[PDB]
Amino acid sequence: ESNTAGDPYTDYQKASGSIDKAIKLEARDPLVAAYPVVGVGMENLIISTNE
Amino acid sequence: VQDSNGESWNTGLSINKGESAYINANVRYYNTGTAPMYKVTPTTNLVLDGETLATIKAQDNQIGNNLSPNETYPKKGLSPLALNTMDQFNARLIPINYDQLKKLDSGKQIKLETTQVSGNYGTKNSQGQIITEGNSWSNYISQIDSVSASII
Amino acid sequence: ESNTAGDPYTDYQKASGSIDKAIKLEARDPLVAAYPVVGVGMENLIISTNEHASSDQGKTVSRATTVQDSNGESWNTGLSINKGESAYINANVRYYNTGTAPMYKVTPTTNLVLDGETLATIKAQDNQIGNNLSPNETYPKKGLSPLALNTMDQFNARLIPINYDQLKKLDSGKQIKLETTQVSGNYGTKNSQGQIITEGNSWSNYISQIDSVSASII
Amino acid sequence: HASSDQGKTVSRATT
Ligand SMILES: [Ca+2]
Ligand SMILES: [Ca+2]
């Protein structure tokens, strides 16, 4: 398998670090996937009553 | 003969019962992974008392260019985004009808929930230039979630 | 045949497993087709009747000398309605997959049928597209609230209207049914460099070829 | 486009 973890980067690109430099150190192990988990959080909510 | 000197003053108020109010949510994005996301495009449901009022995809005003792991968009010391519109071109505001407005004027809250997020990854092309355009993260979400074990 | 089953993947690609890793196990047999079966299901339906209601008050004073005086009041209440766009419809849907392959960029088309007549055929635009639909799962996922099929426009700016007769009969036992007439979506293939690409890879180019050369087993 | 309306009125007149 060239991409062991299933992410866009191969085993060599991850081990050798020749990828994006914002990827966490953790994710340069071929077994740990480089993978973002993004979520949204609402702060407040405003109602424009259009009479 | 006769004379008359009258005065008058009137006050009126109208309302549309299909678009009785406009909704504006203030949001912030969060990354808790090991990779940064470029061109972050979330999709969110706005749920009020069982019913989903609107499913909104983040358009050009609400997209975040970079989102590194363990950080937010906007950054920590900024105010949250405004999720104003439902249109592809940021020209159409999010409406709610008369019953949803009447119950919103009570203890009822509107909850938000992220159904998915879009975004790109970066790769170095022929010359040493990082490209993050055709590099959708969605082509790998199923392939990663299927071959893996999840640890939080 | 290089593609015995009629799916986008050859015999060697399926047998050896060098394809998408979300493809179900059985679908890596050359005879079983890698093929998703996506359907839509409605959860509830909301009606925004768009009347226009008006209130008004008023005072008035008056004097009249040949002597006289007068102090009148008023308060009025009106209500108007359009009969071609008497209400707006909002359906809450959720997509399902019961196939052996994931669908990327799931774009369904649904009829909204009310007492014999189809009110609208809606194609899922940018707000209502699901990026991933892996087999035996839903969009949105199990623990989320359903989508809002809110608009009928290519740009998500035009709401779904119903006229006065459809609204009047909808204020009765009449229900609006939803039915999926088709679903479109992409599949993934590894390109020259090992990047998965799911853009020109439409699933509709193989639905007829698969449905013709196959036997169906539910 | 169908429209309805109601209305009341009170009045007093003193010579
Ligand atoms: Ca390897
Ligand atoms: Ca063959």
Give the N-terminus to C-terminus distance of chain A in angstroms: 63 Å
How would you spell out the order of helices and strands of chain A?
HE
Tally of strands of chain A: 1
Global Rg of chain A = 19 Å
- How many helices of chain A? The count is 1
Strand content of chain A: 15-25%
Bound molecules: calcium ion
Keyword list:
part of a larger assembly; 4 chains; 51 residues; mainly beta; 1 helix; rod-shaped; binds calcium ion; Iota toxin component Ib (chain C); toxin; Bacterial binary toxin
Give structural notes.
Chain A: This is Iota toxin component Ib. This is part of a larger assembly, with 4 copies of chain A. Chain A is rod-shaped and about 60 Å long. The longest helix of chain A has 5 residues. Chain A contains 1 helix and 1 strand. The first copy, chain A, is mostly beta strands and 51 residues long. The complex binds calcium ion (CA) (2 copies).
Give the topology:
The structure is cut from a larger assembly and holds four copies of chain A.
Chain A: H1 11-15, E1 38-49
The complex binds calcium ion (2 copies).
